[PDB]
């Protein structure tokens, strides 16, 4: 009977950087997904492996909500099969993803005059992430053949870079808050059902 605490996800006061993307588990509650889907507040609402209109008819074992901030022209990377700096090095969906990707422009909160630099992404990595892998390491990245000896220098980079969100950026460079819902089915009773 108790409603899932989606407010705590979508209306969180702080959002993680994408390299350090945040996961919240949702269980033992009733989920009204149609109110989410019909909400005008979302620039993006795309589902994979499920119909958005039919989600209220389904029961899952658990639901996971992953949330973070990226720039607008990167929202397309939060989808199965995609590549780029975010899909490759920060947050990776599997080909067989069952869930929904939800995003909205947060320029009013996440940009500031002079630039908001609080949000970071991983610019360099020795290999691509596996699906749902999370890398919060900060080893110096060796882009060339010479050693770094643990410090930045010639072809040796700190692996994270800050987004510089300024209010006057074009939309492709504006901040977007993103929530990825994953629907999990285990060999157990369902605990997250529609109304």
């Amino acid at each position, epitope marked *: 009977t108790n409603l899932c605490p989606f407010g705590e996800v979508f209306n969180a006061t702080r959002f993680a950087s994408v390299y350090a993307w945040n996961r919240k588990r949702i269980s033992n509650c009733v989920a009204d997904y149609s109110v989410l889907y019909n909400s005008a507040s979302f620039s993006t609402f795309k589902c994979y492996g499920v119909s958005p209109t039919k989600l209220n008819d389904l029961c899952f074992t658990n639901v996971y909500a992953d949330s973070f901030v990226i720039r607008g022209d990167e929202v397309r990377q939060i989808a199965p099969g995609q590549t780029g700096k975010i899909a490759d090095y920060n947050y990776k969906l599997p080909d067989d993803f069952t869930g929904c990707v939800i995003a909205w422009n947060s320029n009013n909160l996440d940009s500031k005059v002079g630039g908001n630099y609080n949000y970071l992404y991983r610019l360099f990595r020795k290999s691509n992430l596996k699906p749902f892998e999370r890398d919060i390491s900060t080893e110096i990245y060796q*882009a*060339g053949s010479t050693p770094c000896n643990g410090v*930045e*220098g*010639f072809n*040796c980079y700190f692996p994270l870079q800050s987004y510089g969100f300024q209010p006057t950026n074009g939309v492709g460079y504006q901040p977007y808050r993103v929530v990825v819902l994953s629907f999990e089915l285990l060999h157990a009773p369902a605990t997250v059902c529609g109304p």
Partner: antibody
Amino acid sequence: EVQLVESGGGLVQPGGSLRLSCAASGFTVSSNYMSWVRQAPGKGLEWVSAIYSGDSTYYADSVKGRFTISRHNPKNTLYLQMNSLRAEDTAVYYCARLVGALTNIVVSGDGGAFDIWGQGTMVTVSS
Amino acid sequence: SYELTQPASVSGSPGQSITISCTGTSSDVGSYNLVSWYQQHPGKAPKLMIYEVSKRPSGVSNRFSGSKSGNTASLTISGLQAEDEVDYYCCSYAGSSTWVFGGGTKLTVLG
């Protein structure tokens, strides 16, 4: 239309200080490795200092502890702050772009060379 | 200060080849494939001719070639032209994000 233009050179007394500037056009110092290289009159090139990502700085032992390399991105300018100047620091000072592995004119490999140079600014340390 | 060692002067006749050497140590030339060469006209900034031992920047004549053996790098100039009568410098990575130039060579084109 890539260009580097040094300024700030002049006459300084031994022990004095002087700040050189290097204005870039056509590209951004913030996204490139940069260096200062100097040349005493009639003599050879001497690498002075470099700056890489994260404003990580490195210096020749001949100037270490006395010189500081820095960037100001809004002005798209590289600086060299020179303190405790010696007569042996007299030279034309050039700013240059140091190609690296991620430079756009590198197809593969590590770069490791100075391809864009300013015209130089003359520094004379004398009493 | 520590520098790579180049002959002060070399001479060659037009149409012939000339080589300029650049001797460092096991910890610079001998450790990395990061040797570059520069041409310098009087009063002008150096021009990059060779990098990563043997690569030429776009637009640089294939008359210029670079190589290395042990602690010594070499620039070879073929089809010598009056235009070549300038100074040449080598440069190498010297480890831990530092660089070291050679002392320079004045090339004379005879004939």
